[PDB]
Design a protein around this motif. Sequence first.
Motif, PDB file in Angstrom:
ATOM      1  N   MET A 112       1.537   6.419  -7.410  1.00  0.00           N
ATOM      2  CA  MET A 112       0.445   7.234  -7.939  1.00  0.00           C
ATOM      3  C   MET A 112       0.757   8.723  -7.814  1.00  0.00           C
ATOM      4  O   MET A 112       0.549   9.501  -8.760  1.00  0.00           O
ATOM      5  N   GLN A 113       1.257   9.137  -6.648  1.00  0.00           N
ATOM      6  CA  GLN A 113       1.618  10.539  -6.461  1.00  0.00           C
ATOM      7  C   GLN A 113       2.726  10.949  -7.420  1.00  0.00           C
ATOM      8  O   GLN A 113       2.687  12.043  -8.002  1.00  0.00           O
ATOM      9  N   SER A 139       0.807  -1.215   0.000  1.00  0.00           N
ATOM     10  CA  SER A 139       0.000   0.000   0.000  1.00  0.00           C
ATOM     11  C   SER A 139       0.843   1.268   0.000  1.00  0.00           C
ATOM     12  O   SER A 139       0.441   2.274  -0.592  1.00  0.00           O
ATOM     13  N   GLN A 199       2.184   1.732  -3.682  1.00  0.00           N
ATOM     14  CA  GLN A 199       1.137   2.112  -4.625  1.00  0.00           C
ATOM     15  C   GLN A 199       0.818   3.599  -4.524  1.00  0.00           C
ATOM     16  O   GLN A 199       0.729   4.301  -5.541  1.00  0.00           O
ATOM     17  N   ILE A 200       0.661   4.101  -3.297  1.00  0.00           N
ATOM     18  CA  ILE A 200       0.375   5.519  -3.098  1.00  0.00           C
ATOM     19  C   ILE A 200       1.542   6.373  -3.575  1.00  0.00           C
ATOM     20  O   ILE A 200       1.348   7.397  -4.246  1.00  0.00           O
TER      21      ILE A 200
END
Lengths: 60, 44
Positions: free
Chosen positions: A39-40, A32, A35-36
């Motif tokens: 994405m950022q 997790s 992934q964040i």
Amino acid sequence: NGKWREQLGQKFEEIRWLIEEVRHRLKTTENSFEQITFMQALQLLFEVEQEIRTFSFQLI
Amino acid sequence: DNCRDVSDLKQYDSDEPELRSLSSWIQNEFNKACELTDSTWIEL
């Protein structure tokens, strides 16, 4: 300003390279945190790429 | 009184709810909710 003009193509050389690398690594990952972060980074890179293209078009 | 002549009668959709898996956007929502802003938003 002599060599300054020619690095635009140099930057464009790795722009989509790194964007594709980020896309693939975001697809592959499972955590997790990663992934964040990815994405950022992707959103940041889209913004920066627009920005640099806009200024490059305006200046010339 | 005439409602029992229908041949397409079903009780209800009393079925088990669908199962879902955890995603990562809720943690981002909490992180963004835990951070500070510029306005005041309250006054007592």
